[PDB]
């Protein structure tokens, strides 16, 4: 649905349908990004609706394939970043600079790999500063830890709150066997995203396109090795 079509609906006509987890479609407009006046713009209603989640799996078949195996979603329609705002810089030559500041810009997503492995990840574009031409402008964003520093594991252990040992074992606690799990870290990561401006409507100041984002998955608060998650989808924004 276009943005105006979405506003015509009421909350009771949208609730439970799935439209709320979709980015607006930019119809009319044109493809030449030169229709935008060269200058600075206030990014608004910036949405990123994924269309595919894939996870890089190490190939036991040798050859270092590390292909992105398809996944199945476990967490339902809770995975589209929306209402993001920031700054959009467009040049005379077509150079594009997108810098996001706030909004949703993160959403916990869990997918299941062939074999029963649930791989959670914090799908985010926090502090995304993408620079490039309108065909391929991309950048690097921040991936905060999937769990916060006050998250308590099932044994009460945590980074900023909780025990620092396996209290359950009053003698075997603090052993090098459990030391790794006893110590929990909530450091952040970084990921790479590439965007493209497929269509632009200068009349309404609305741009749309596709994106591809590769970011690490959850590390279990430092207790697990991350995986690469590739997210592809469509993005929408309103320049103003």
């Amino acid at each position: 649905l276009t943005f105006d079509q979405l506003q015509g609906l009421t909350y009771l006509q949208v609730k439970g349908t799935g439209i709320a987890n979709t980015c607006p479609t930019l119809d009319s407009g044109s493809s030449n990004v030169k229709d935008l006046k060269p200058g600075t713009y206030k990014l608004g209603k910036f949405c990123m609706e994924p269309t595919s989640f894939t996870v890089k799996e190490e190939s036991q078949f040798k050859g270092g394939d590390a292909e992105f195996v398809p996944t199945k979603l476990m967490t339902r329609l809770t995975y589209t970043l929306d209402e993001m705002s920031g700054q959009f810089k467009v040049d005379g030559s077509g150079n594009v600079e997108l810098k996001e500041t706030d909004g949703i810009d993160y959403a916990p997503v869990t997918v299941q790999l062939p074999g029963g492995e649930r791989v959670p990840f914090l799908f985010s574009v926090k502090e995304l500063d993408a620079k490039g031409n309108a065909d391929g402008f991309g950048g690097e964003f921040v991936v905060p830890s999937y769990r916060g520093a006050t998250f308590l594991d099932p044994k009460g252990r945590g980074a900023a709150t909780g025990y620092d040992t396996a209290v359950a074992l009053p003698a075997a606690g603090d052993d090098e066997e459990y030391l790794k799990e006893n110590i929990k870290s909530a450091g952040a990561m970084k990921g790479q995203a590439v965007f493209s401006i497929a269509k632009v409507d200068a009349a309404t100041g609305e741009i749309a396109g596709v994106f591809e984002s590769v970011q690490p998955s959850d590390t279990d608060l430092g207790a697990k090795a991350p995986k690469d998650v590739k997210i592809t989808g469509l993005w929408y924004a309103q320049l103003s």
Partner: protein
């Protein structure tokens, strides 16, 4: 009266001696009607006498005055109580009417004829008379239809009804275009009772409430006329026990459903049970808490939009499993909640971040702050708060009293269905007094 010697019913089943005594049975039902009217008047005067304007209705343990308030009596914009005289006259009118009702019940029970059949053929009846029973059913079905029309007459022609969703703030509003479309009416009746649907509890505007009571008033009048001019058909005569105790069990089952429905109405509905009078619902208080802290934390400086909680989900805002932007935390379960204070800040996609960031009015903040401190949590001795609270506040929500009491009544009246229906079939078949030793049915049956 009677005795066990001439009846076979002990004193603890004494009212069972009135089954075939039409006149005395009439007095009993008229007397208990006087008791119901008496309580309504007595409690109305009690609640008025114990009412102080310094506190809202839901803090003073009133359950009848909120009903009168919702009918648009003695209330102004925003739910403020402006006058108490309409509540007083309502209480007196019931209290006096109970006296004449009690006299008829006392007369028809002690002095009046024991049976109405011989002296008053119009009122006389025998339970097995399927025709006469439907006429009595038909007549009392019409008076129910007229009662339903009184509600729509008041909401459309006599002052109006209190609309908590009214534009410009909740106030007494005259309904002019009730929703009478069949699709809307059938939509409520046949939607699931589960979350998001809520069956008829989910009626969310007074146009639907009045439009619904137009259908009920019209159906009852037509159903009353139909059940007067007809008698049960062949398929009905072979599908029901035609005895007095059987008719009682039919109502006990039906009244049991109504008790459960009332329990869920008082707990969830915010349209026919405005939170200005009944207090916040369970979901409302939970949503109010996250709203209150979001407002405070934004003022203390925080992008509530991108604030991440300890679990990785949004601390203040997240997405519902269908995509709507909802408040975060354990309140995620109550994302279906719709209130007159949070709806203005809700676009077609859910909560509006821009509205939540720049356009939150102080009356909305005041409403949410009050609701979170008057959550329905409370104790039996009326100590407000969670079980780990201290004796500081004397408060239990009227919704908590209404939901709990009318669930207990609803369940016991379901056992009434089970009891009075199992006995009706057994009494009619003829083995409610025990197994006959001469011909035990199992002995005739072949061994298992």
């Amino acid at each position: 009266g009677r005795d066990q010697e001439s009846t076979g019913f002990a004193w603890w089943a004494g009212n069972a001696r009135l089954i075939n005594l039409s006149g005395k049975l009439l007095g009993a039902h008229v007397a208990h009607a006087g008791l119901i009217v008496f309580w309504a008047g007595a409690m109305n005067l009690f609640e008025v006498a114990h009412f102080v304007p310094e506190k809202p209705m839901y803090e003073q343990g009133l359950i009848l005055l909120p009903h009168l308030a919702t009918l648009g009596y003695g209330v102004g914009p925003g739910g403020e109580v402006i006058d108490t005289y309409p509540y007083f006259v309502s209480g007196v009118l019931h209290l006096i009417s109970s006296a004449v009702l009690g006299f008829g019940g006392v007369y028809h029970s002690l002095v009046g004829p024991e049976t109405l059949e011989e002296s008053f053929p119009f009122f006389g009846y025998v339970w097995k008379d399927k025709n006469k029973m439907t006429t009595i059913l038909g007549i009392h079905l019409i008076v129910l239809g007229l009662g339903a029309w009184l509600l729509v007459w008041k909401a459309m022609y006599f002052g109006g009804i209190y609309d908590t969703w009214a534009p410009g703030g909740g106030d007494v509003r005259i309904i002019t275009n009730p929703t009478v479309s069949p699709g809307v009416i059938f939509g409520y009746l046949f939607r699931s009772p589960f979350g998001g649907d809520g069956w008829i509890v989910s009626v969310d505007n007074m146009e639907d409430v009045i439009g619904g009571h137009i259908w009920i008033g019209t159906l009852c009048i037509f159903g009353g006329i139909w059940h007067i001019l007809t008698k049960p058909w062949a398929w009905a005569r072979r599908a029901f026990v035609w005895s007095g105790e059987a008719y009682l069990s039919y109502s006990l089952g039906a009244i049991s459903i109504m008790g459960f429905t009332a329990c869920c109405m008082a707990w969830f509905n915010t349209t026919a049970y405005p939170s200005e009078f009944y207090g916040p619902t369970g979901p409302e208080a939970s949503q109010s808490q996250t709203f209150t802290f979001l407002v405070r934390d934004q003022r203390l400086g925080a992008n509530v939009a991108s604030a991440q909680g300890p679990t990785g989900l949004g601390k203040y805002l997240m997405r519902s499993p269908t995509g709507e932007i909802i408040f975060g935390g354990e309140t995620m379960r109550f994302w279906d909640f719709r209130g007159p204070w949070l709806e203005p800040l809700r676009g077609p996609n859910g909560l509006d971040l821009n509205k939540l960031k720049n356009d939150i009015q102080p009356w909305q903040e005041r409403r949410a702050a009050e609701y979170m401190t008057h959550a329905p949590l409370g104790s039996l001795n009326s100590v407000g708060g969670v079980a780990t609270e201290i004796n500081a506040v004397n408060y239990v929500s009227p919704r908590s009293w209404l939901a709990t009491s009318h669930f207990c009544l609803g369940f016991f009246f379901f056992v009434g269905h089970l009891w009075h229906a199992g006995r009706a079939r057994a009494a009619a078949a003829g083995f409610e007094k025990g197994i006959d030793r001469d011909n035990e049915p199992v002995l005739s049956m072949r061994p298992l």
